[PDB]
Amino acid sequence: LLANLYSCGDQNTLMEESAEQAQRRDEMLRMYHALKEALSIIGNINT
Amino acid sequence: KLQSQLLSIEKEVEEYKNFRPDDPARKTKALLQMVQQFAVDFEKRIEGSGDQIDTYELSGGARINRIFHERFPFELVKMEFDEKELRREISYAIKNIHGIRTGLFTPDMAFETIVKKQVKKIREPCLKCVDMVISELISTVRQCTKKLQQYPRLREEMERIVTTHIREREGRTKEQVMLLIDIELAYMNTNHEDFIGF
Amino acid sequence: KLQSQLLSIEKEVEEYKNFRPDDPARKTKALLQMVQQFAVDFEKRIEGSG
């Protein structure tokens, strides 16, 4: 099966992501950075 | 609280932050992961291999097919052979086998002629059992592809390729089934578990 | 006898007949198949499956 799937042309279009995943990973990156900033502020307040 | 959230999200965003759309390495790594997932899910439903057992349904291909091999015996007994027409044709067979002679012992060709007529009937339930099993397999393949939703054009192709293969194997499977019945007509072995001596 | 022997060779030489010294597509599918073989073989040796 793996060799048959790979041999089909246009591998760049066979594995294209759906628009939902582009949204999911973009949001998780923003959430990840925001959490770090928030945890930084708490560290600088406890002091 | 914030520390726990970072730990949960970190394992995935580690990859998302390096995303580039022009990355053949990601596409091929994704391809190998989807194919390995499908082959593990497929074997799970049919063979029962793995530690992820569905305790709500019947396993699908594994136990639907396992029962097709126990509905099939039912198909082999719905024959309804008419006893009266047997006893008539047995009588005419004996007289015609003896022919011009009065006959001294019961003929064998009468026994062979009757059996060959009944054995020819089995062809129907055998070609049903094949169609039933093909249909069940196509079902289980369609369940296994439900996990590739995040990749369109890969759920279609993997369905098409595995589906086409299962269908093309129908011809060769039926030919062997037909042949195994001809083998039964070709020679009458009476030295088996039978009324020897009687 | 000759026909039986030739069947054991066709499966493999179909790859050699189109061999090129520089074929990234050939190498890529060779890598993936070998990675998949290793993972399946390893799990089989320790788990005891198959």
From Swiss-Prot, chain A:
PTM entry text: Phosphorylated by CDK5 leading to synaptic vesicle endocytosis (SVE) activation.
Signal peptide: none
Origin: domain of life: Eukaryota
Cellular compartments annotated: Cell membrane; Membrane, Clathrin-coated pit; Cytoplasmic vesicle; Presynapse
Comment, domains: The dynamin-type G mediates homodimerization and plays a role in self-assembly.
Disorder association: Developmental and epileptic encephalopathy 31A: An autosomal dominant epileptic encephalopathy, a heterogeneous group of severe early-onset epilepsies characterized by refractory seizures, neurodevelopmental impairment, and poor prognosis. Development is normal prior to seizure onset, after which cognitive and motor delays become apparent.
Subunit structure: Homodimer; homodimerization is mediated by the dynamin-type G domain which promotes assembly-stimulated GTPase activity. Homo-tetramer formed from two dimers in the absence of lipid. Oligomerizes into a helical polymer that self-assembles around the vesicle membrane, when associated to the menbrane through lipid binding.
Known role: Catalyzes the hydrolysis of GTP and utilizes this energy to mediate vesicle scission and participates in many forms of endocytosis, such as clathrin-mediated endocytosis or synaptic vesicle endocytosis as well as rapid endocytosis (RE). Associates to the membrane, through lipid binding, and self-assembles into rings and stacks of interconnected rings through oligomerization to form a helical polymer around the vesicle membrane leading to constriction of invaginated coated pits around their necks.
Family membership noted in the UniProt record: Belongs to the TRAFAC class dynamin-like GTPase superfamily. Dynamin/Fzo/YdjA family.
Descriptive protein name: Dynamin-1
Organism per entry: Homo sapiens (Human)
Gene assigned in the entry: DNM1
Full protein stretch here: 701 to 747 of 864
Swiss-Prot record, chain B:
Phosphoserine: residues carrying this PTM: S8, S49
Assigned keywords, A-Z: Cell membrane, Cell projection, Coated pit, Cytoplasmic vesicle, Disease variant, Endocytosis, Epilepsy, GTP-binding, Hydrolase, Membrane, Methylation, Microtubule, Motor protein, Nitration, Nucleotide-binding, Phosphoprotein, Synapse
GO cellular component term of the entry, any: chromaffin granule
Predominant cellular place of this UniProt entry's protein: membrane
Subcellular location: Cell membrane; Membrane, Clathrin-coated pit; Cytoplasmic vesicle; Presynapse
Plastid in keyword set: no
Sequence positions bearing Phosphotyrosine: Y56
Post-translational modification (record): Phosphorylated by CDK5 leading to synaptic vesicle endocytosis (SVE) activation.
GO MF terms, alphabetically ordered: GDP binding; GTP binding; GTPase activity; identical protein binding; microtubule binding; phosphatidylinositol-3,4,5-trisphosphate binding; phosphatidylinositol-4,5-bisphosphate binding; protein homodimerization activity
Signal peptide range: none
GO BP of this protein: clathrin coat assembly involved in endocytosis; endocytosis; endosome organization; protein homooligomerization; protein homotetramerization; receptor internalization; receptor-mediated endocytosis; regulation of vesicle size
Disease note: Developmental and epileptic encephalopathy 31A: An autosomal dominant epileptic encephalopathy, a heterogeneous group of severe early-onset epilepsies characterized by refractory seizures, neurodevelopmental impairment, and poor prognosis. Development is normal prior to seizure onset, after which cognitive and motor delays become apparent. Developmental and epileptic encephalopathy 31B: A form of epileptic encephalopathy, a heterogeneous group of severe early-onset epilepsies characterized by refractory seizures, neurodevelopmental impairment, and poor prognosis. Development is normal prior to seizure onset, after which cognitive and motor delays become apparent. DEE31B is an autosomal recessive form with onset in the first months of life.
UniProt name for this protein: Dynamin-1
Organism: Homo sapiens (Human)
Gene behind the chain: DNM1
UniProtKB/Swiss-Prot annotation, chain C:
Compartments where located: Cell membrane; Membrane, Clathrin-coated pit; Cytoplasmic vesicle; Presynapse
Disulfide bonds: none
Domain of life: Eukaryota
Modified residues (Phosphoserine): S8, S49
Outcome following mutation: L32R: Significantly decreases receptor-mediated endocytosis
Post-translational modification: Phosphorylated by CDK5 leading to synaptic vesicle endocytosis (SVE) activation.
Family listed: Belongs to the TRAFAC class dynamin-like GTPase superfamily. Dynamin/Fzo/YdjA family.
Function comment: Catalyzes the hydrolysis of GTP and utilizes this energy to mediate vesicle scission and participates in many forms of endocytosis, such as clathrin-mediated endocytosis or synaptic vesicle endocytosis as well as rapid endocytosis (RE). Associates to the membrane, through lipid binding, and self-assembles into rings and stacks of interconnected rings through oligomerization to form a helical polymer around the vesicle membrane leading to constriction of invaginated coated pits around their necks.
Subunit annotation: Homodimer; homodimerization is mediated by the dynamin-type G domain which promotes assembly-stimulated GTPase activity. Homo-tetramer formed from two dimers in the absence of lipid. Oligomerizes into a helical polymer that self-assembles around the vesicle membrane, when associated to the menbrane through lipid binding.
The record's note on its domains: The dynamin-type G mediates homodimerization and plays a role in self-assembly.
Descriptive protein name: Dynamin-1
Record gene name: DNM1
First and last residues shown, out of full length: 299 to 348 of 864
